[PDB]
Amino acid sequence: LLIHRKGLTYLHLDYNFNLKPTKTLTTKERKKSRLGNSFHLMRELLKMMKLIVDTHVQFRLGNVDAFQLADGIHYILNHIGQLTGIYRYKYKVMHQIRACKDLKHIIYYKFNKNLGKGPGCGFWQPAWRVWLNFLRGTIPLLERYIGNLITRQFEGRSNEIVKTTTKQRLDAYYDLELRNSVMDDILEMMPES
Amino acid sequence: MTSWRDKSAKVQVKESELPSSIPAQTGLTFNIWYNKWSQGFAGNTRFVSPFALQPQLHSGKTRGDNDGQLFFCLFFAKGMCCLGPKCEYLHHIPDEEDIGKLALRTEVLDCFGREKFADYREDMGGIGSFRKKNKTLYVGGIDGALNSKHLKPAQIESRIRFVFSRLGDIDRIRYVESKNCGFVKFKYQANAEFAKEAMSNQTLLLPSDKEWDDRREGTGLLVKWANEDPDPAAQKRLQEELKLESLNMMVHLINNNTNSA
Amino acid sequence: DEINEPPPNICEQCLGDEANIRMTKIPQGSECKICTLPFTLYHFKTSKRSNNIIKTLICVRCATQRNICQCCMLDSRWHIPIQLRDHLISLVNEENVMTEEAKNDMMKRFLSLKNVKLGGAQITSDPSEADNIVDKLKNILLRAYASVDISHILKKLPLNESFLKNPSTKSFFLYNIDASIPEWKITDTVSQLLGIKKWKDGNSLSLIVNHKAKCGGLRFQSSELGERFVSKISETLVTPKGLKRGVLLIDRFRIFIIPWSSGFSAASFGTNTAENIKLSLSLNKLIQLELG
Amino acid sequence: YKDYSRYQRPRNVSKVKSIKEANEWKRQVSKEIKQKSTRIYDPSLNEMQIAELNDELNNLFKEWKRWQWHI
Amino acid sequence: HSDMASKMYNTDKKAFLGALKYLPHAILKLLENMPHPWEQAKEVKVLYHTSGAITFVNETPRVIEPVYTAQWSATWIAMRREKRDRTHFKRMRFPPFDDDEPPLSYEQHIENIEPLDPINLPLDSQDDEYVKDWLYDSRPLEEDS
Amino acid sequence: VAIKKPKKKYGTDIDYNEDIVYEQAPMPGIYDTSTEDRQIKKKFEQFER
Amino acid sequence: HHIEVVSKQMDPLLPRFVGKKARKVVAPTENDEVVPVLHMDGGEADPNEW
RNA sequence: GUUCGCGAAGUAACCCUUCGUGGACAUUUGGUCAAUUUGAAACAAUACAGAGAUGAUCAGCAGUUCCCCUGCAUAAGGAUGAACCGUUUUACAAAGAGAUUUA
């Protein structure tokens, strides 16, 4: 509903939450269809949730063994940096991916003592904590990002935007000061009129 | 009474028989927020209404009559109301008793309950303005209504005089052949608002014509709000009735000061 | 000032008769109908068991500048519309008072934020300046196409037959109809004469009036109504050749009738507007030939 | 769909199909009639150019006759 | 609200966008309430919009810490045993569904089917007499006053 | 055939021809410009005629 | 009429302040009185310089 | 409908069933909102135009605007985002000559 309200109807969401264009785009489309880091991180977050719920579905339908299910969640939570692609919109989540790769090393050599190198491991509880804590820290972040976006959709953006100075416009603003000070000290010493 | 109060209102269209909510496809993908079609061009978008009001047939008591509802059913006028006698709004031609109830209310909103706006729409279509008590409709687009039958110029007015006479008391009906359009003025504004939605996208065919099977293929006529009447034979009638309206208000207004003192 | 805002201006007849009314405040509800700028939407119901929500459509500033309520937009004193108010004051001051309104969005907003009154809103909201103008209303109450070939058509108009009891006809021919005198007013006058009121239910009579040809015709179902229409009309005029004509009597007007003795029908008065005017001009003489 | 804003005239008038279809090809002439009529009266001063443009007008106006002739 | 194209849905269309800010909160309440391996189905308590915009899982999972440590220790041994004796362990395929097909409705395709066996350890009868009644309950000793 | 207006570029684009643009009325003075307004209006309606 | 004014319990998902948008307005200047610009003096001799 | 009474009838023997009749219990939902054309998304496409400082090609920052777009953004992009590139007459005087008027 967000994509269709923005006017974008050539962007398709598949049901596994990938956003793909339906056609080759003019540049006026590519400037219009830039979705920010809020939407995509929200889309990658639902994709992770859809990815976990569907494995519990395929166990529930009888298609998946109970030990395959526990390996399934253990495969997901170790490889969210491989299955989703949430890392590009917040690279800070690479800390959690290092956490889920480190716990994976800690669990395996405890688990895979004396039984080879199979894919059977399904002790998904520690890596489950890491994404559950990361979801704790990015509730308030995403509430702010998407709260700004929808109020920008429903109200437009502000007319009163004032540009703070940065590195690029430093010498330009130093000019506008220097013009105005010389304007004042000469317009005060003129005769009159 | 005998035609209206005696019976109850009848279901015009079955709820399965109602049209689909999506419009006809004039684009490549459907848009979900705005319920329209997006890519490519935009074609026409006007079609003949499949449904029409038979006023002496479909009128009757409804649920809004016992509740004291003030407003008329919008889809009674289009011939589309699927609730029948279970509908909250009224299902009959507006009468002097009915517009007397709407008298405090008609000033800002129509007989259908939709709010009037400040100025008119650009094509004089839609609901209307509260700034002008317009009682005259511009009956236009008559060629697409008639399915491009010629007929004559005065027979077209005969179709207009028969259809709009069922929708209320009429001040006058004027047809202009060179402009191929009619001007129907009503006694009340509420009839004019009622007949506007009743006769939008309709056809003046009368099934005694051979195109009656192809009434759907046409375009459908435009009933819109009329502009002022530019001939001074009508302009002098405007300020004459505005004078009589002012004299009828001053008698009522000095009695307010009589009671105020 | 968003924290210091006036109370809403609403009528007495908007609020109705009951004593206590529960009103809902929404601090930025809808935008104004007039100035297209947001305000505090109040809405309420007359009784508790009503079924109509009465909303405030315009902001208080647009309601102040016009001196109208926010709900029904009638004037706060005199309870009349704005167009009729500025026309009543113009008959007193002999100059046009008029509130003019923008059609541009940036000038609908600009015209509201100024603190003036508009139109008759200087006269109203001053009870002294309103009451003397009512007294000034009171003294006003102390005063209290020769090239057309029309001959194909006048053969079908009767123009030569009499209004007697003895022909038993359905339709009649109405001429001497002015450019005033609306189509409903003639049908009410006939239905008042016959007591066949709420005639549109049973469709007892059908009437077509051109208003350009200054002519009409009324058609009856069930021909026995024709003799009731004849016998209920007493005053007639006899042309000095003969051929008596009944008069229909709408207030200050006179309309003559003939039993048509067929179903004339639309296009009988004409097929073109330039052609229709000459039919009025053709009768002008016969009316003067009937009377004088 | 299929726009009628993409394709050509199409060249032969008699080979065109049912009447609800040639109606939109017909207005697909009238717009260029309207556009290049506005391009007649312009003071832009190229007398050679508006002469070949005048011939294109006469060509399209003859087509407009032919689309009306088929109907 | 599967296919919402009517005019009545206009306020509810706004509601879905307005619930988008709350949606990472619902994901937190969903993934913390995920069923642990020993349980087939887990009935959670939800808070939903009357327009059906969003469905929050209105629960926090409390566990008893010695009970929870033993429960995962039992499933640790069970998966450690299961990996040993299975000839070939087939990891499931990701993503589980085709992206073309919509997520299938619960009441038609899932609610009727029996679940499946859970990952419960063999369990001793003599050594584990006190705990074998209630170790694999969804909420262990929930009604034991 | 009437002249077509220029198309609005943005939403609140102003038809300057439609109304007094940003009507800054003059300050209300004392010297009673009552007959003078009648003579401009008579002259301005004469100019449009 | 004595009027009881209450607040509507809004849907926390539908946006609050429905008539609120980022629109730009130009404001008229209300002037009832003229502020006199009270300078003093009519030197003023100009040496052609400056 | 429940519960407390009171009365009448029948089974009863003071209890049960029936229907008469006082109480008590429980007390004013929802709507800023009606279901396709006529109360307002936009974009693609056709055609035409063709691209800041320059001779020529190339980096850009800004600034003013009743223009905004994307972005979570006070970051940054949008062609240096765009528009700008035109129109242009009186706080007006002092001094010195030849035609023409006046009365």
Ligand SMILES: O=P(O)(O)O[C@H]1[C@H](OP(=O)(O)O)[C@@H](OP(=O)(O)O)[C@H](OP(=O)(O)O)[C@@H](OP(=O)(O)O)[C@H]1OP(=O)(O)O
């Ligand atoms: O780099 P290697 O020495 O070959 O180690 C691999 C590698 O370890 P990680 O899982 O930590 O990355 C595999 O991971 P992939 O990058 O190939 O996905 C992993 O595969 P699984 O995740 O399927 O276990 C496999 O582990 P295992 O052998 O238990 O299957 C493990 O090799 P070792 O575990 O034997 O060291």
Ligand SMILES: [Mg+2]
């Ligand atoms: Mg840069």
Ligand SMILES: [Mg+2]
């Ligand atoms: Mg920039």
Ligand SMILES: [Mg+2]
């Ligand atoms: Mg760039």
Ligand SMILES: [Mg+2]
């Ligand atoms: Mg710039």
Ligand SMILES: [Mg+2]
């Ligand atoms: Mg460049």
Ligand SMILES: [Zn+2]
């Ligand atoms: Zn209805």
Ligand SMILES: [Zn+2]
């Ligand atoms: Zn306002």
Ligand SMILES: [Zn+2]
């Ligand atoms: Zn009012």
